[PDB]
Paper text:
The RNA-binding motif protein RBM5 belongs to a family of multi-domain RNA binding proteins that regulate alternative splicing of genes important for apoptosis and cell proliferation and have been implicated in cancer. To study how RBM5 recognizes cis-regulatory RNA motifs, we investigated the roles of the three RNA binding domains (RRM1-ZnF1-RRM2), which are connected by linkers L0 (7 residues, between RRM1 and ZnF1) and L1 (20 residues, between ZnF1 and RRM2).
Crystals of RRM1-ZnF1S bound to GGCU_10 RNA (lacking two bases at the 3′-end of GGCU_12) diffracted to an overall resolution of 3.5 Å. The structure was solved with molecular replacement using the RBM5 RRM1-ZnF1 apo structure and showed interpretable electron density for seven RNA nucleotides (UGGCUCU). The first uracil (U1) base forms hydrogen bonds with Arg140 from RRM1 and N2 of guanine at position 2 (G2). G2 further stacks with Met101 and RNP1 aromatic residue Phe142 of RRM1. Arg203 in ZnF1 forms hydrophobic contacts with C4 and Asp128 from the RRM1 establishes hydrogen bonds with the riboses of both C4 and U5. U5 and C6 are solvent exposed and not involved in any base-specific interactions.
Numbering used by the authors: 8 to 114
Amino acid sequence: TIMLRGLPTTITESDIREMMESFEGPQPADVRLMKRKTGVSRGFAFVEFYHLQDATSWMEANQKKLVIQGKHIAMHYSNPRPKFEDWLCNKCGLNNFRKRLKCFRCG
Ligand SMILES: [Zn+2]
């Protein structure tokens, strides 16, 4: 899970994956361009991985090497930022909300 920010308001989830079949590191598992309620993508997008060596090598050599729409974008770690009454999942280790009973990785 690595986030990249600043994707324009007309970019398809494919538009980032049309040129991300060629960067370094072994091929990933899942890519999620964050959506909204009306059906728009607000600037940020997460990348999951099969392995951790692959993500490490991805951020290793080309952190500040990815240009689309004439603007560089950072590729930064993703660590949860919780609140007071937040729980944990015993099969994914993913932090999720309190008024919801299901995790966002397996359920
Ligand atoms: Zn989980």
